[PDB]
């Protein structure tokens, strides 16, 4: 609040520009930090190891609990992966699922942005349309690069 | 002169220190706003009867302490730009920022489920 | 004489049950009527005409499409922004303002 109070107080539709600038800068900073981090090879090794561990543990949990579940319905190695490249063991329907969920989550950004900003006063309508489209495509491309 | 020029998208004039001093003395300055990261830039709006009509000047006020009484004496009304409405709008924005994370969580969950079962691929 | 008044007072108390349950059944009827529009033949006719409109609109706007998808950011706005940003930072020397850029 002190943050937003300061940028409202010190610097004709200017405060909204400053606030949008602040929020965009902050989100971009966090995203750039994360991408720059995972751009290191050993960190990719780290995340690959954690992924195979969590996959195996989820498999154990799944077997156990599904078996006890259809029992209640009755009532009523590591190296082959760890030494091979990532994409040859993972199917493509998984990434297609990830992409479909992402798309479905963010597919309403342009309309929300346009409605929020819009209530020579409406000579800015082309600018807000351009901004909506560009921002939506930025989100999609950031998914792509990550 | 004003008779040998074209009207072009009126801009903020510039006054140094004493034209503004004489203007606030003669009783023609109507309002002033302070701004700048260093709390010494002023945007001054004059009133109708003044020579030239209502216009907007920009002045840099060198630190002199007897300015305050000078302005307040001649009825100048010093102002800001933080009227209660923008404060309320800022608090509204902060509230939306507080809510944005759980709503995005529940939306991600709903769409994981809808992508999985309630609307899968046809075969 | 008795049974008729008894069934009448039960009629009235189940009318009470209905009064304490009016908004829920009302909004249920509302969402049912809403879901009723999007299963007619009218709605599939509409979807197919929308398809025709999208086909005609795609055939007349190939240049604008490629502009907004490939050119607008990557080759127009991003390099401008990057150069202006770099020159806003980066103190006023020559090794930093011209040579390393």
């Amino acid at each position: 609040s002190a943050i937003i109070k300061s940028i409202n107080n010190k610097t004709s539709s200017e405060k909204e520009t400053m606030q949008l600038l602040l929020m965009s800068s902050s989100i971009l900073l966090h995203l750039c930090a994360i991408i720059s981090l995972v751009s290191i090879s050993q960190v990719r090794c780290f995340v690959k190891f954690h992924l195979i561990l969590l996959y195996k543990l989820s498999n154990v949990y799944n077997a156990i609990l599904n078996q006890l579940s259809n029992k209640l319905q009755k009532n009523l190695g590591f190296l082959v992966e760890w030494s091979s490249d990532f994409i040859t063991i993972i199917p493509e329907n998984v990434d297609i699922y990830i992409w479909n969920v992402f798309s479905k989550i963010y597919r309403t950004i342009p309309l929300s942005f346009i409605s929020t900003t819009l209530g020579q006063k409406m000579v800015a309508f082309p600018i807000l349309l351009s901004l909506s489209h560009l921002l939506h495509r930025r989100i999609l491309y950031l998914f792509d690069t990550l | 002169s004003v008779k040998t020029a074209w009207r072009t998208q009126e801009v903020l004039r510039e006054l140094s220190y004493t034209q503004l001093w004489a203007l606030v003395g003669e009783g023609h300055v109507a309002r002033v706003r302070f701004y700048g990261p260093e709390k010494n830039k002023v945007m001054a709006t004059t009133r109708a009867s003044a020579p030239g009509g209502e216009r907007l000047c920009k002045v840099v006020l060198p630190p002199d302490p007897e300015l305050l009484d000078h302005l307040v004496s001649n009825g100048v009304v010093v102002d800001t730009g933080v009227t209660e409405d923008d404060r309320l709008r800022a608090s509204l924005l902060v509230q939306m920022l507080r809510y944005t994370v759980p709503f995005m969580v529940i939306s991600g969950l709903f769409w994981m489920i809808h992508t999985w079962i309630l609307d899968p691929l046809p075969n | 004489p008795l049974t008729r008044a008894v069934l009448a007072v039960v009629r009235v108390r189940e009318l009470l049950r209905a009064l304490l349950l009016l908004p829920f059944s009302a909004v249920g009827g509302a969402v049912a009527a809403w879901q009723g529009l999007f299963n007619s033949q009218r709605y599939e006719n509409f979807l197919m005409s929308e398809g025709e409109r999208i086909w005609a609109w795609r055939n007349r706007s190939e240049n604008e499409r490629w502009f907004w998808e490939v050119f607008a950011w990557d080759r127009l706005i991003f390099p401008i922004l990057v150069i202006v940003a770099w020159e806003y930072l980066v103190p006023n020397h020559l090794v930093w303002a011209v040579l390393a850029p």
Partner: peptide
């Protein structure tokens, strides 16, 4: 953030 820094810097009292 370098544009907003002179504005945000008043939360500490500095220039």
């Amino acid at each position: 953030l370098a544009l907003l820094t002179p504005t945000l810097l008043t939360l500490t009292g500095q220039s």
